[PDB]
Design a protein around this nucleic acid. Structure first.
Lengths: 140, 198, 99
RNA sequence: CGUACACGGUGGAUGCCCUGGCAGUCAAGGCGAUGAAGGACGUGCUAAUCUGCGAUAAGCGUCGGUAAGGUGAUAUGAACCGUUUAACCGGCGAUUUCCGAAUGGGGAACCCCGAUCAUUAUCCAAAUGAGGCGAACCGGGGGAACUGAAACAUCUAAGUACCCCGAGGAAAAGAAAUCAACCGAGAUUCCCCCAGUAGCGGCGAGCGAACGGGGAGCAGCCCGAGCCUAAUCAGUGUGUGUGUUGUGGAAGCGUCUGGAAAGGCGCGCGAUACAGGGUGACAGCCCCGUACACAAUGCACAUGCUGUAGCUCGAUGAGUAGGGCGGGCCGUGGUACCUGUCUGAAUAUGGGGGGACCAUCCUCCAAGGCUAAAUACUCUGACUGACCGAUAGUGAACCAGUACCGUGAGGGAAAGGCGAAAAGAACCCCGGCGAGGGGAGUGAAAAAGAACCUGAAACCGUGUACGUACAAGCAGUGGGAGGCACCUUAUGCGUGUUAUGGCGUGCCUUUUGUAUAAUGGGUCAGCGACUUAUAUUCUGUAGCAAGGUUAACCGGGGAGCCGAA
């Protein structure tokens, strides 16, 4: 009724998870305590991302290679068999999650189930010759 | 299982529905307190397109500060600007997540399928024009004390319920944890339950 | 509301029964009714309360909670005086419910 | 004289309250040569301040609103005004001193005139402009250093701080001699993303795009001649809606406690009206007010209408493109942009561009111009706040930017609360006394009497308990003896202090070692020092599992990111 509701206001929803006693970021509360790294710990942090360097000086160094065509697009047997049907050449790949704004791919026989659908691709490996030959179709 | 719906006559049974998600009474208590807190002010900082004119503003010395409209911001020097310290995004609010906030939204939907909770009401509920009719359907329902809890529905905002105690009407589309549980508690309608599924 | 143009009827204080016209309304919420006064040292009919003092606040200081202007209800009070040029206020005055 | 306590005081903490601040949000947004902003001096019967006006001086007139009382904050004394309807709240007009852009000339507010520059020009200042102000936003120029690089000359901080000139309420850009995933996109900004990628760099530290895509918002058009005219231009009439502000009005029971209920208990009621305030204590139904409706103001932008007026033909802009010398600046690399000196083309049967140069494709055509829309503060009005609470919060809840300091620029406090009502101590005694004291009165309470609620600690006086002028020093613990004093915690069970005896060198940092002739503090209270986003890497807990998460923007999105050899 017109009485101070036993409780019906705002402190309700849900504690993120476990009893959040106070806001995060708390470690060594106000005042003095540890929470740090004794010794030369102060004016500046320790690491930097390099070294003296004894290791970074001149190990078995390499270099910055030139940009590649950016092939390597997983096109596995199955997931292309137990799905859709025939006609799976360059035009119907967007349907599947096989569509890089770049080019090329490869077939990786994750499964063996017969299909026997055909697939162009523009690439090929062992197993790409196997199958789609014993099943039918033509690779390019 | 099967959630027994109720008719206007608060009949013992009607259709059935439910939500599947490990309900967490660890997912129904603060969140909206954070909503209650966070929803009320919070000086972010950089969030603003304020820019600098540089020198030559107006015939007078005007430091090229992160200005905007006619007053400076962002810069820790002027108010409403970004705090110059470390660990807190807005004002006195609870830092945190998009997932738990939602996880609480999912988990809450599941809270409904709990014995000591709400109950599903047939669609006809949305028809009730007068408020008094609701009070009755709440009495026979044996959940009149739920007025201390809250209320909800589907289709459109229920004008007949809006009046009722601590009633903040909401629709199955846009419902926030706060609604699903105006304090880890609530009540909905048949269609609402279906809409919320998405 | 209360207007200095309305006649009031005390009901609680020792001036219970006296009738008179208001003399002025203060922001404090105290009203002075014409007739409700006190007897000064040199016998001067001036409104005020009671206790030894010096310079002082006039008016008997009456509370609106114990006065009786119009008050539709089963009470012992009777008639009360009241603008007219408004017209709309005349309709309310004519209604046994409003004024 | 040591300690504890008691009564009173000091002091002002604390608790409660707060007519103030702090923060966020919505709305609204310019003022001035018909001389403003600001300042000075005046003005009310008495008025010193503040406020309002200004010599028709806290005011005059008109209309509307409002309403019977009123003569600002100050509730004084006297007096006066109002129903020939005032006070009070809103449009328009009149008046509107002097200085001040002032502008005749001079000048620390005083004395005599369009000053100075400039355009038109009947060259007469005759007709006009500029010359100032305004919180910070946009644009155009000039342009550091401390600092980082743990040194420093590139680089970095900076194109920042600071200097100059100018606009608007908003500014800049802009219809492509573009982009360059193409049988394609296709004006320009801005947001997200693409990217921390390409690129730059003692390639050291660091620095750092764009195309595209997803969105917001969309509009395209002007210069020689021929011809002719519904674009434009001038003028007229003149809103809706919306936004802001203001406005209309009735109603209170029973029992108990109390000085009084807005209490407790019982019963009942309203709600397109589950804001707030007031009223002798926690009143949604006692009063205002809130729904409702009305009125005023701003909006005034627009639309309609009168007279104006299409369209056609050809070309299309050189000290430029470009080259050389010397610099600035940029992410700009032989591949950014701009300045200065010198040199210097061709023309669409031409030329430029697609991130190196020169001959062969695709795209587009500079060296002329304009162009709506997409946001951004907080002076001002209103609202809100798990914000602070008067050594807190704005420096300012109290005369505050006042008192006060400095030649000046400039600097800069502290001070909140009587009581329901003042109802604020009548009368009497005392005294040098409107001081004060006693007595007495009011009230629930003055153990509220006026820097007056509550009122602590340090501390003062007195007094109480107990010591105490042979006594040795941490000033205790345990044991046993002495007593004195008190039996609101009856039980051979305790307190206050204490005589005597056995032991006992405050407390904190630095240092190998400090009680230490090592440093710091006279005492007290209050004050007084690890925090933000992002990214990376672990850990504990929890959900679901090769899938998983979205970002801008829409409850959808999957761009994109990481993982999958």
């Amino acid at each position: 009724n017109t009485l101070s509701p036993a409780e019906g206001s705002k402190k309700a929803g849900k504690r993120l998870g476990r009893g959040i006693g106070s806001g995060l970021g708390k470690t060594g509360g106000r005042g003095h305590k540890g929470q740090k790294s004794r010794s030369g710990g102060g004016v500046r942090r320790g690491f930097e991302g390099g070294q003296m360097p004894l290791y970074r000086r001149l190990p078995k160094f390499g270099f910055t290679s030139r940009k590649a065509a950016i092939t390597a697009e997983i096109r596995l047997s199955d997931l292309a068999k137990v799905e859709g049907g025939v006609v799976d050449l360059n035009t119907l790949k967007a349907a599947n999650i096989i569509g890089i704004q770049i080019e090329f791919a490869k077939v990786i026989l994750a499964g063996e189930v017969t299909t026997p659908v055909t697939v162009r691709g523009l690439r090929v490996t062992k197993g790409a010759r196997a199958a789609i030959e014993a099943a039918g179709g033509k690779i390019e | 299982m099967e959630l027994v719906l109720k008719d206007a006559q608060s009949a013992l049974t009607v259709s059935e529905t439910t939500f599947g998600r490990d309900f967490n009474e660890a997912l129904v208590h603060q969140v909206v307190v954070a909503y209650a807190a966070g929803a009320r002010q919070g000086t972010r900082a950089q969030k603003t397109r304020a820019e600098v004119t540089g020198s030559g503003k107006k015939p007078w010395r005007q430091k090229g500060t992160g200005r905007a409209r006619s007053g400076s911001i962002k810069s820790p020097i002027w108010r409403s600007g970004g705090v110059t310290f470390a660990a807190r995004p807005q004002d006195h609010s609870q830092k945190v997540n998009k997932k738990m906030y939602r996880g609480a939204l999912k988990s809450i939907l599941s809270e409904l399928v709990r014995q000591d909770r709400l109950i599903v009401v047939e669609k006809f509920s949305v028809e009730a024009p007068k408020t008094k009719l609701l009070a009755q359907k709440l009495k026979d329902m044996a959940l009149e004390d739920v007025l201390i809890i809250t209320g909800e529905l589907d289709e459109n905002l229920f004008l007949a319920a809006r009046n009722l105690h601590k009633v903040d009407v909401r629709d199955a589309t846009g419902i926030d944890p706060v609604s699903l549980i105006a304090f880890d508690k609530v009540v909905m309608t048949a269609d609402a339950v279906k809409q919320v599924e998405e | 509301k209360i207007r200095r143009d309305d006649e009031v009827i005390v009901l609680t204080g020792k001036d219970k029964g006296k009738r008179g016209k208001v003399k002025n309304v203060l922001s404090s919420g105290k009203v002075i009714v014409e007739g409700i006064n006190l007897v000064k040292k040199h016998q001067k009919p001036v409104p005020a309360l009671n206790q030894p003092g010096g310079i002082v606040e006039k008016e008997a200081a009456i509370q609106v909670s114990n006065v009786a202007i119009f008050n539709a209800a089963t009470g012992k009070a009777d008639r009360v005086g009241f603008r007219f040029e408004d017209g709309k206020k005349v309709r309310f005055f004519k209604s046994n419910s409003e004024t």
